Design a protein around this ligand. Structure first.
Ligand code: SAH
Ligand code: NA
Lengths: 265, 265
């Protein structure tokens, strides 16, 4: 009679919380999805071994179209868990799944875990200074979406930082690198000429947040655009005006050029 | 030889990640602070028992003025851990502490935990739609903070949601309630009269996130300003222009007046 939305955390099988692990171990059925994101520092097998339960993986369609026919029925007479990378309900359409549960007479509870939304705090950029967030999508055919460029513009204009999620093809396991995101943004700049993203723009790249050895790099596009940030996923941040303390952290921890102490503060 | 920045989570000791617990269990010395937030469902003893270590609790002064005199010296010969509520670097000033560690020749690592910043997802509000965040601070003497009011205005103008962290005076065991935040905001409105926060403003209250039964309420100020939301900690959220599904969730899950289902696009 109960559905548990449990977050898996950031990177590996140890990123789930003690609460989430203990609750999962007591559920009769355990489902999971890796279409919104993947756990790059681990495998389904390692997650399964840790929880000690077989984990039925669900596709985006299984969830979006048939959550009520695959997951909820079992929740009527058993304890069911639905695992997702990061923190549950962060992915835009997941909150609605709780409404579906209610409509089915199923009680649901949320077990939180670290999310990239809070984990970026490791970049040294103040959390309150982040503005609207965006996702960089690949242009395709006759479609060249550029809204993510306008997000940066509106944020930076108000001295706010912009968190950018990079395109991902979960099933194809194809990632967009921070390098590719930068090239795309430079191409968007050439079209819009807004003076929003150029070779002189300061950016921060966060890779493998959650790992004990994440990659945190900060610098100007012209120097970072061809740098190797390692294995994904990559997160790109275009920070607005910098607090002197933010800049000092970026210099001392993220190897940023001391130039930002005078140029971006 | 190393220093560990380990977050403890939202509500109780089980909100720590498995990674955090295993590492904390093996540290030689364990320090912590409980002034940046409130973990309403646990006690120092319960945490000590889980980790199996004695925990030396530090005050704001011990940390801000003496971190490098109390904690760092031990990290030069042992593995030290510094625990904090929620995520260690979120809406705190602990990030700067990594610079202090570096300057003292001490390597530091960060272990994330669920944070209130991402837990807002449980309100049904799309997390990418949140704008600049703010903090409602208790007035003191003749000083009456009001910057948080302008944050709302700026976000609302952009159709973005506003997350408001609430004040805490841990040494006095004072935790600002969503009710007190609403009272303060109405007073600022009387002063500025910008039509930013009034009796007709829709707000969302999230209390004790991380517990199994957090209080999640949505409604007009006039109706919620005196509602009992349970024990602290609380956060107040002033949503912008709602998506249809956001409104549906607020009504179905947060008990908002069904009339907000009708969005003025
Ligand atoms: N579990 C919780 N439920 C509701 N509000 C919370 C909360 N935890 C923190 N808050 C809010 O956040 C404020 C502290 S700011 C520190 C946040 C912490 N570092 C984190 O990552 O979560 C509290 O005063 C309250 O306003
Ligand atoms: Na945000």
């Amino acid at each position: 009679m109960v559905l548990y939305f449990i977050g898996l955390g950031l990177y590996d099988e140890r990123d789930i919380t003690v609460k989430g692990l203990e609750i999962a171990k007591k559920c009769d059925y355990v489902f999971a999805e890796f279409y919104t994101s993947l756990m790059a520092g681990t495998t389904l097998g390692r997650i399964q071994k840790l929880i000690g339960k077989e984990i039925r993986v669900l596709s985006r369609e299984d969830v979006e179209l048939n959550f009520e026919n695959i997951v909820l029925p079992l929740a009527k007479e058993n304890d069911v868990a639905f695992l997702t990378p990061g923190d549950p309900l962060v992915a835009t359409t997941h909150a609605e799944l709780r409404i579906r549960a209610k409509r089915a007479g199923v009680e649901s509870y949320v077990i939180h875990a670290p999310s990239i939304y809070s984990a970026v705090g490791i970049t040294g950029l103040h959390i309150y200074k982040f503005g609207k967030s965006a996702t960089v999508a690949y242009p395709e055919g006759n479609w060249f979406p550029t809204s993510y460029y306008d997000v940066i513009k509106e944020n930076a204009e108000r001295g706010l930082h912009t968190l950018m999620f990079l395109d991902i093809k979960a099933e194809k396991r194809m990632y967009m690198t921070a390098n590719e995101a930068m090239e795309l943004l430079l191409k968007v700049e050439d079209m819009k000429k807004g003076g929003v993203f150029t070779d002189d723009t300061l950016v921060v790249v966060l890779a493998r947040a959650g790992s004990l050895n994440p990659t945190i790099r900060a610098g100007y596009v012209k120097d970072l655009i061809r740098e190797d940030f390692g294995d994904p996923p990559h997160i790109l941040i275009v920070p607005g005006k910098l607090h002197i303390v933010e800049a000092e952290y970026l210099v001392e921890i993220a190897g940023a050029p001391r130039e930002i102490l005078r140029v971006n503060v």
